[PDB]
Design a protein around this motif. Structure first.
Motif, PDB file in Angstrom:
ATOM      1  N   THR A  78      74.622  25.462  -8.279  1.00 18.04           N
ATOM      2  CA  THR A  78      75.546  25.892  -8.864  1.00 18.04           C
ATOM      3  C   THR A  78      76.763  25.704  -7.966  1.00 18.04           C
ATOM      4  N   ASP A  79      76.641  26.037  -6.769  1.00 23.58           N
ATOM      5  CA  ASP A  79      77.458  25.980  -5.511  1.00 23.58           C
ATOM      6  C   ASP A  79      76.617  24.990  -4.432  1.00 23.58           C
TER       7      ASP A  79
ATOM      8  N   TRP B 249      70.322  27.932  -8.825  1.00 23.72           N
ATOM      9  CA  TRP B 249      71.528  28.669  -8.088  1.00 23.72           C
ATOM     10  C   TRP B 249      72.017  28.074  -6.924  1.00 23.72           C
TER      11      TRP B 249
ATOM     12  N   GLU C 236      69.518  31.668 -14.419  1.00 25.16           N
ATOM     13  CA  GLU C 236      68.376  30.989 -13.704  1.00 25.16           C
ATOM     14  C   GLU C 236      67.220  32.084 -13.525  1.00 25.16           C
TER      15      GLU C 236
END
Lengths: 46, 97, 34, 89, 35, 42
Positions: free
Chosen positions: D56-57, D53, D6
């Protein structure tokens, strides 16, 4: 020769940092950890 | 009334405070000052007898997104319990006029 | 000619944030016995 | 050190690091290293890669304040590193 | 940003402390469970 | 929250209670804040 004004500024900075860190970590981890522990014993499904 | 008064034996220290009481039965009583109380009320209770039942911590969260118009929400939820109703005393001021 | 070079003052500084500070159950209902 | 995808930006006409003509990599470096190379009198040089990012979580938010004061030299700042094959001369 | 930047966390901490103070005051205050 | 998550890991303990320690007793446990920070406080 540490000044008290330096310590006050440090206290303020650390307090705000702790506030932000708590506001994040709570919803990041603990909101899930509580329900995970509840499921551990099967107490969440009512 | 001539039954109790202070004394200063050449002491350069004025202390007009009292934060501990002992009644004829022997039960001591600590005193704490909290600004978040109502003017006309005093609470006789115990720390353990009362507990703050929380449901969910603040839990930083978001509502929606319309573009640049960001929003945020909190989900604080708690509840109060008392062990015995007839275990914490309170006295008010009334009977005026 | 006429060089003084005493009025630059190109600080271009930003704010510093010097503000002041003054700082589990599962169900929705809970009960106890007495 | 590891480096996510990213925080990377590359050209389209490239197929490998060898023939790569342009290659960028945004980094988060403190103000100390920057003061070690430029603007010693000025230390207040403030400012998809964040969305991918933070997705991602669902816990982290790179564009937030973890508590670091902006004036503190250790305050992390985004810098742009680039490798370019070109005759700038 | 021009002046300070990163106002979101500042406002969020402010609101957190605000709700803390509010909870303290309202909990130490008396009100029935009118429903 | 730090107390809620702990008292909910189980359903027996309550960290915010009194196990019997007098407040004036030197051994009375108290909450302190330890921190590690990377910053130019200077």
């Amino acid at each position: 020769k540490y000044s008290e004004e330096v310590l006050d500024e440090l206290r303020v900075d650390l307090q705000r940092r702790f506030n932000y860190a708590q506001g994040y970590v709570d919803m990041a981890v603990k909101g899930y950890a509580r329900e995970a522990w509840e499921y551990f014993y099967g107490n969440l499904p009512a | 009334q001539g039954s109790r008064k202070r004394i200063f034996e050449n002491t350069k220290q004025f202390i007009y405070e009292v934060n501990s009481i002992t009644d004829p039965l022997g039960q001591s009583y600590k005193i704490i000052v909290n600004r978040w109380m109502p003017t006309d009320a005093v609470y006789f209770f115990r720390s353990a007898d009362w507990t703050q039942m929380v449901l969910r911590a603040p839990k930083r969260t978001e509502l929606a997104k319309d573009g640049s118009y960001e929003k945020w929400m909190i989900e604080m939820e708690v509840g109060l319990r008392h062990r015995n109703p007839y275990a914490s005393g309170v006295l008010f001021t009334a009977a005026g006029k | 000619t006429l060089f003084v070079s005493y009025d630059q003052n190109g600080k271009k500084l930003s704010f510093a944030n010097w503000i002041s500070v003054l700082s589990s159950i599962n169900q929705t209902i809970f009960s106890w016995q007495t | 050190e590891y480096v996510p995808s990213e925080q990377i930006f590359v050209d389209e006409h490239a197929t490998s690091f060898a023939d790569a003509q342009y290659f960028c990599h945004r980094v988060r470096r403190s103000k100390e290293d920057l003061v070690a190379m430029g603007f010693p009198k000025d230390e207040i040089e403030a400012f998809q890669s964040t969305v991918a990012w933070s997705r991602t979580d669902w816990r982290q938010d790179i564009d937030a304040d973890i508590g670091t004061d902006t004036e503190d030299i250790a305050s992390m700042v985004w810098v742009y590193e680039h490798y370019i094959r070109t005759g700038v001369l | 940003n021009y002046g300070r930047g990163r106002e979101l966390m500042y406002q969020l901490e402010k609101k957190g402390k605000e709700i803390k103070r509010d909870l303290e005051k309202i909990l130490l205050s008396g009100q029935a469970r009118t429903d």
